[PDB]
Amino acid sequence: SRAEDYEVLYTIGTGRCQKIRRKSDGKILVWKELDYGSMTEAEKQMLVSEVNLLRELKHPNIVRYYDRIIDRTNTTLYIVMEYCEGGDLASVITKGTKERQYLDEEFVLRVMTQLTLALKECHRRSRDLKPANVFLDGKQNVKLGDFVGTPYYMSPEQMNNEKSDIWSLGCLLYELCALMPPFTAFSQKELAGKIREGKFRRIPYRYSDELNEIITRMLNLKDYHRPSVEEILENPLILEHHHHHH
Numbered sequence: 449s450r451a452e453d454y455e456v457l458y459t460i461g462t463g464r465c466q467k468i469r470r471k472s473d474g475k476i477l478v479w480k481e482l483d484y485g486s487m488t489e490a491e492k493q494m495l496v497s498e499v500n501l502l503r504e505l506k507h508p509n510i511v512r513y514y515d516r517i518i519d520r521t522n523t524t525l526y527i528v529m530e531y532c533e534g535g536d537l538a539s540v541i542t543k544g545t546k547e548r549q550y551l552d553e554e555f556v557l558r559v560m561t562q563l564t565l566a567l568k569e570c571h572r573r574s575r576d577l578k579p580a581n582v583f584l585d586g587k588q589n590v591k592l593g594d595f596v597g598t599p600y601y602m603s604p605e606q607m608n609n610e611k612s613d614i615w616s617l618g619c620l621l622y623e624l625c626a627l628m629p630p631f632t633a634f635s636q637k638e639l640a641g642k643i644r645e646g647k648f649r650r651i652p653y654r655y656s657d658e659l660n661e662i663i664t665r666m667l668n669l670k671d672y673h674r675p676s677v678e679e680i681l682e683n684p685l686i687l688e689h690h691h692h693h694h
């Protein structure tokens with residue numbers, strides 16, 4: 449695997465994320481460009497570990513890693529992976545916010561189902577749940593990727609556990625429905641205050657009582673009252689078509 453095996457089409461974001469084309473079969477992919485020139489041997493060893501871990505993750509709802517390419521000349525490491533043509537959930541939400549248009553319940557259910565399964569897989573093996581780390585492919589599939597900011601999704605436990613991940617999922621699904629997170633504040637201390645009270649607005653009325661109910665359960669103050677991944681997926685809301693399809 450050499451860089452010359454691929455051709456950069458253009459830069460998606462900025463190290464650098466680029467949409468690329470594999471020359472042999474024309475397959476569309478992306479790579480993440482990492483300049484390791486300024487790294488110590490220690491940090492490079494830490495980098496080697498991380499990349500090996502990504503190679504082991506095979507799941508329909510986790511962004512698929514394909515390859516790693518070393519360019520010793522430019523001291524650049526390339527991580528090759530699947531392309532998610534639908535971009536990230538952050539952009540979907542800001543888009544709904546600016547166009548004043550709520551997302552379909554069907555879409556929210558797809559995200560709930562598919563991220564819950566990604567989470568289930570993560571818990572098996574041993575990756576923050578936030579809109580910017582959730583990607584959409586071209587087939588309605590949902591995939592989990594990998595100081596200044598306010599920690600909107602921090603659970604009550606953390607500010608003091610797999611149920612903690614359930615809280616964060618609740619926050620993400622809440623924000624998808626309401627187009628704002630369940631707890632907002634100008635500082636972290638004000639934020640922490642709101643989280644401890646555990647009160648928030650119901651998601652918009654266009655969304656079913658059943659969907660409101662499960663999101664609300666995920667946001668319970670007590671970790672042990674939050675549903676497990678198993679209890680989530682048992683929900684009558686969740687159907688075959690909400691799962692991944694090739």
Ligand SMILES: CC[C@H]1CN(c2nc(-c3cc(OC)c(OC)c(OC)c3)cnc2N)CC[C@H]1C(=O)O
Pocket residue numbers: 460461465466478479480511529530531532533534535536539583593594
């Ligand atoms: C490469 C590192 C990242 C991001 N990543 C992928 N991102 C995109 C992607 C596509 C977009 O529009 C077509 C887009 O604009 C909204 C965008 O915004 C951030 C991202 C497509 N495919 C990807 N594989 C993969 C996961 C992730 C990581 O760090 O592991």
Ligand SMILES: [Cl-]
Pocket residue numbers: 508509589692693694
């Ligand atoms: Cl899939």
Ligand SMILES: [Cl-]
Pocket residue numbers: 548549550
């Ligand atoms: Cl609105």
Ligand SMILES: [Cl-]
Pocket residue numbers: 551552553554654655
């Ligand atoms: Cl709807």
Ligand SMILES: [Cl-]
Pocket residue numbers: 645646647
């Ligand atoms: Cl309450």
Ligand SMILES: [Cl-]
Pocket residue numbers: 649650651652653
């Ligand atoms: Cl409301």
Ligand SMILES: [Cl-]
Pocket residue numbers: 610611675676677678
């Ligand atoms: Cl669980």
